[PDB]
């Protein structure tokens, strides 16, 4: 029953300033029943300080970003565990096995970011004349009925700004 | 005079909600004397304005190639809406109009059957894993292979062939090292089509 | 001005000694005012004279269609000899020449494997019998089906697809009643190709 | 070992005067070894008298047409059991599994018969502007190394001249 979402994407994209490129995330959704559902493909962006040896993604926190330990992450400057602004969101409504994800597209939002844009009818992000300002840790999170069904991370940056991202998970 | 060619979106872009399908209106044989081209797009007669022009490209055979891209909604395409592109240029007596949309006809779900290599083929160094996809309509489809969640790129797929019942069928052949097969490795045939539940289905094959 | 198209003989005519293969030089857009067309045939440069002209045919679109047929020897064709047809007509500033011959490349014997229907298919009205013909070169081939010496006409064959090793492969699907297959009936895949022993081979399929 | 020859063809072709047509015999040869062999595809024509109720083909006689009982058939005017002239012969030499029948073509002979001809690179007979003179019992015999490996018969005629042909065989 319900819906299954599977995401595929490289963990990093290294770019040199001035280049134009886009992410290459693959997302498939399988509706096991005829229940109607909503879907949101959300892109989150995290600052990666120069002084950080690596970024730490608090996986369990993605599901409850409002818990105390998630709002105030111990690895504080180098942790992806909660968010306020969402870089971009593509929403779907009235989705079903018979009215599948592309067809149930409804809304799309994106923060004003120089050189950033949606590659038309796609969940991927496109970077034009990329610059150091675009470097950071990006997460693509897929919600179905307001619950995360899949997620992935991509460190998109220049070589000098790059810091390995590590997923902190439960046992 | 310039010539126009209107292309449909990729099958995978229309079937996956994580992708963005688009119709492409390509204008060739554009002259240096008059390279300015006007585009008028319509969807079921209603004119739309969200199209973007790709950067102009010199072809080196005395002409330019001007292209306009229109993003479409997965459901709009799948529902059989018609997209018309009108091209106007001073070297053209009258505007040229091309129209394209999904193939018309009731969509039918493809039946997918994996077929193991013939026992006679075991004398060879590599073997053939078959995947029969039949009874589908329209012909817009995407077929790929994988093992352990990893994509297997060593395959060839026949183009869709029109069957006697008005549906289409095709065959996909993945070639693998005989050793891999005889060891019990599980391989899967992934098919994407609009008539499948959630536009996807996967059928496994192993010894 | 007239146009010329040179066609190779049928695969079955070159592979069966009981048939007579021929090259056909077709001239279209022949005018009503000057339909006189001269043909000059050559085989490896050496001019030959045994060609015959088919009766002239009115196309009703203001032009005639003039055709010349040259009979060829099975071995001459199979040995890669080149056939050139030169077409001259008053409306032609200079004679037009087309050349055609067998595809060049070492011939490779096709491997034929019959594949039974999937277990999953055993619940439908009709089952699919597969025949995989791979590793062949050139693509000139003929594939048919039969049972009890009688020809089975309910099949579809994919066009040859170029494999990653420079050879060709294809799939043929015969659709029959589950009853027939269940009963133990014997069905066969007949393949004709120059590289086969005697240009022939049959592969049986049953329980 | 050796060679196998299989022939296929209808037993009769009814034609009306003035028509142009050809036989449609199918012949396949399978060389089971690499031994070299010769082949001859021979066409025999037999007169079918008006007074004959039917023609009788002495099958065993085809293999030894020089035996007394075959040279002087009991059903005399209505029997196909021996021959002198051969209507047509297409010969093959130096044939083998690797140099198969079409490729080993060597010679071809045909008696001068108004309107009769070989359909170029074929074993079939072609009749142009057919007339009653062409009516009769025709046999196509395939020899491999001078021994019959396959044979078939075709009664080719107008309706009025047609007489059923019967194969007289051993038990
Ligand atoms: C001057 O040069 C021009 C440029 O040519 C260059 O390449 C060579 C030709 C060189 O010799 C040199 O000249 C140049 O460097 C030349 O333009 C060509 O003109 C042709 C005739 O006018 C024209 O032929 C038509 O081709 C159609 C098919 O086009 C596709 O396939 C060809 C070959 O594979 C490819 O080159 C084209 O670019 C087209 O490719 C498709 O493009 C679309 C749109 O971008 C892709 O779809 C989108 O893809 C994106 C990718 O991210 C998204 O996925 C999006 O969702 C999709 O919509 C698509 O994937 C891609 N497919 C392929 C396979 O690559 C035929 O359809 C057409 O035939 C039809 O119509 C005619 C007439 O009605 C009929 O006769 C036919 O029976 C049929 O009905 C026709 O053959 C060439 O396409 C064109 N080449 C280019 C590159 O534009 C020009 O003529 C030259 N002029 C002079 C005077 O010399
Ligand atoms: C005036 O009217 C003419 C006739 O029009 C009418 O006929 C219809 C077919 C339509 O054309 C329709 O409009 C009308 O009702 C018209 O002639 C046509 O002109 C075309 C352009 O000049 C020309 O195009 C070429 O076609 C080639 C393929 O032709 C074959 O296939 C088509 C169908 O698929 C068929 O119609 C043709 O007759 C050809 O068929 C083959 O015929 C040969 C010879 O008979 C067969 O081979 C022999 O068969 C015998 C037994 O019959 C023995 O077995 C022997 O051993 C064999 O050798 C063969 O079996 C058969 N095959 C098939 C599949 O039927 C293309 O190859 C060619 O493409 C090349 O060139 C173009 C450029 O021109 C490139 O773009 C391509 O990439 C490629 O390089 C080209 O498309 C048509 O062939 C021609 N039709 C006919 C019947 O002649 C004429 O143009 C009109 N003119 C005006 C001013 O209006």
Residue numbers in the entry:
A (entry chain F), D (entry chain E): 220 to 390
B (entry chain A), C (entry chain B): 237 to 443
Q: What text appears in the publication on this structure?
A:
Attempts to crystallize a gE-gI heterodimer or gE alone were unsuccessful (ERS, unpublished data), thus we concentrated our efforts on obtaining a structure of a gE-gI/Fc complex. Crystals of gE-gI bound to Fc were large, easily reproduced, and had an ideal morphology, but diffracted weakly to ˜5-Å resolution. The resulting unusually high solvent content (79%) may explain the limited resolution of the crystals. Second, although symmetry was not imposed, the solution is nearly perfectly two-fold symmetric with the two-fold axis relating the two CgE molecules coinciding with the Fc dyad axis and each CgE molecule making similar contacts with the same region of an Fc chain. We used experimental phasing methods to independently corroborate the molecular replacement model. Thus, experimental phasing methods using a combination of heavy-atom derivatives and SeMet-substituted crystals provides further confirmation of the molecular replacement solution and validates its use as a model for the CgE/Fc interaction in the context of the gE-gI/Fc complex. The binding mode observed for Fc and the CgE portion of gE-gI in the gE-gI/Fc crystal structure was verified by an independent theoretical prediction of the CgE interaction with Fc. The locations of NgE and gI in the gE-gI/Fc complex can be approximated by an analysis of heavy-atom and SeMet sites that are not accounted for by the CgE and Fc models. In addition, the orientation of the gE-gI/IgG complex on a membrane, as predicted from the complex crystal structure, demonstrates that antibody bipolar bridging can occur on the surface of an infected cell or virus. The gE-gI/Fc model is consistent with previous observations regarding the characteristics of Fc binding by gE-gI.
Herpes simplex virus type-1 expresses a heterodimeric Fc receptor, gE-gI, on the surfaces of virions and infected cells that binds the Fc region of host immunoglobulin G and is implicated in the cell-to-cell spread of virus. gE-gI binds immunoglobulin G at the basic pH of the cell surface and releases it at the acidic pH of lysosomes, consistent with a role in facilitating the degradation of antiviral antibodies. HSV-1 gE-gI is a heterodimer composed of two type I membrane glycoproteins: gE, a 530-residue protein including a ˜401-residue extracellular region followed by a predicted single transmembrane helix and a ˜106-residue C-terminal cytoplasmic tail; and gI, a 370-residue protein including a ˜248-residue extracellular portion followed by a predicted single transmembrane helix, and a ˜94-residue C-terminal cytoplasmic tail. Here we report the structures of CgE, an Fc-binding fragment of the HSV-1 Fc receptor gE-gI, and a gE-gI complex with Fc.
